[PDB]
Each structure stands twice: as structure tokens, then as C-alpha cells.
Design a protein around this nucleic acid. Sequence first.
DNA 1: TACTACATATGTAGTA
DNA 2: TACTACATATGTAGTA
Lengths: 125, 125
Amino acid sequence: TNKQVEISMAEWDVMNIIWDKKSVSANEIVVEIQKYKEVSDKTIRTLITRLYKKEIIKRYKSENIYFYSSNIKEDDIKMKTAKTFLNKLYGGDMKSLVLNFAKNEELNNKEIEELRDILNDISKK
Amino acid sequence: TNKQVEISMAEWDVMNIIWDKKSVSANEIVVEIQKYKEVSDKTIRTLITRLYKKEIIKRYKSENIYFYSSNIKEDDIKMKTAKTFLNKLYGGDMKSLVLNFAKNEELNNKEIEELRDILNDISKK
DNA sequence: TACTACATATGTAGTA
DNA sequence: TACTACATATGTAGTA
């Protein structure tokens, strides 16, 4: 038995990379994340170490280098995070959140329609 | 000039109450929040104090009691939080998040249709 | 790669 | 109501 599966806000950047590349080396994660923000190799490795310790990822040695892989279902931890978020910011109501989106004009009719599409597509049995 | 407007995860419970009741007393916030979880008067007041200090709320004295009110646009801070969330968990793609919802079966066709509705309703000019 | 360091934050709550 | 206390966490990063 265990508890709360945790992913600090800054940790998602590491996990999204681990989930996206299935099996990766710290160095890899490090270069990938730098491709879009100023972060030190050490900092990222701390995140890596921390995830590894919370057991959200596992590893094995390949050459003499460590390669990491997810030890948690992505769809599940993101979904749990999202409900938390939705409850706190909208009393868990996708409507209330999709409506706050249109309102603040964070969506152009092109995206509004693509959505309405896919979404109409889901209702379709 | 100033910076980052902050609302710790536990703070939203206080703000949602301040935004919902327009002008409130700490005591009020305290009873309201207890109506759904075990939290001490002091704890909640700390949140209140902290928000007040970050200037996300202001106050005036009424009888000799303090009444607080929002000093920030709700639609704006929630929206900023949501983009942050969406970028981190879905590379900012409402589709990708609405699809993760249906998938994990966090939505019954009733809600799926209400959504598709309102949403189809938004595309409607 | 493994530990350690560390200012700031966070969730809880106690003293003045 | 105002401060203080405090374990744990968090984002950054340095030493072994």
C-alpha cells in the first residue's frame, strides 16, 4: 500500500519527456528541456532524482549510463491532476471551464469549431 | 509595477468564497469552508492573511470586524492558471484534454451532450 | 551520479 | 487579529 502520487509543477517537464520517449537518459531529458528554457543540468537531474525516489520512474543501466522509464500511467495521473484543477477553479465543470475559455477569448472560431467537432464526434455512438 | 499574482492550491478555497460572496468576514470564510472539510480557524486565517499580504484581496472594517473583497479579476487569474495547467499537462490543447476526459470515462453521454451542446452553442454566431 | 545546501513557499496551527 | 513556528516541499544549484 502507498499514497499520493506526486509530480511537482516543474516535474511535469521531465515526465512529459519520459512518457514521450519511452526510455531516456538524464542527459537526453536535459537537452530536450533546454530546447525551450534556461535550466541547468543539475536542476533537471534533481527533478529526475526526486521522481525516481518517489518511484514515479524506474531505471536500468545500459552502457554505464542510466535510462529512465515511466512507472505510472500517464492518462491516469494527468486526469487526477485535471479533476483537482477543475474542482478548485470551476467546481469541476468542464462547461464552466470551456465557457471561461471562449469568454476570455482564448479560442478562435477555428479552434472553437475543431473542438465542437471532435466533441460532437465523441457524442456520436 | 509588480509581478506574479499567486494563489497557492489551498488558497483557492478562500478566494472562491471571497469572489462568491463579494464582501466577507474571515469568520464567514471559515464556516463556509468547514461545511466540507476539516480545517482549523487559524489555518484558514493564515491563508486569508497571506492573500491580503500578496494584495489579492483588500479589506475595510465594518463593525470592528474585517470584511474582505477581491482585488483581482477572477476570470483572469483562473484563465492564467488554466493555460499553465493545459500547457504542462497537454501542450495547451483543450482537445487533448477533453479527449483525455472522455477516454478515462470521466464523462457520461449526458454531460458529453450538454457539453457538445453549449460548445456547439459557442460556435454559433 | 549521489548528496547536500538553501531561500522561499506551503499547509497546519500555536502564542501575543 | 497579528505574529511566530515549523515540518515538508519546491526550484535552483553546488560538493563529493
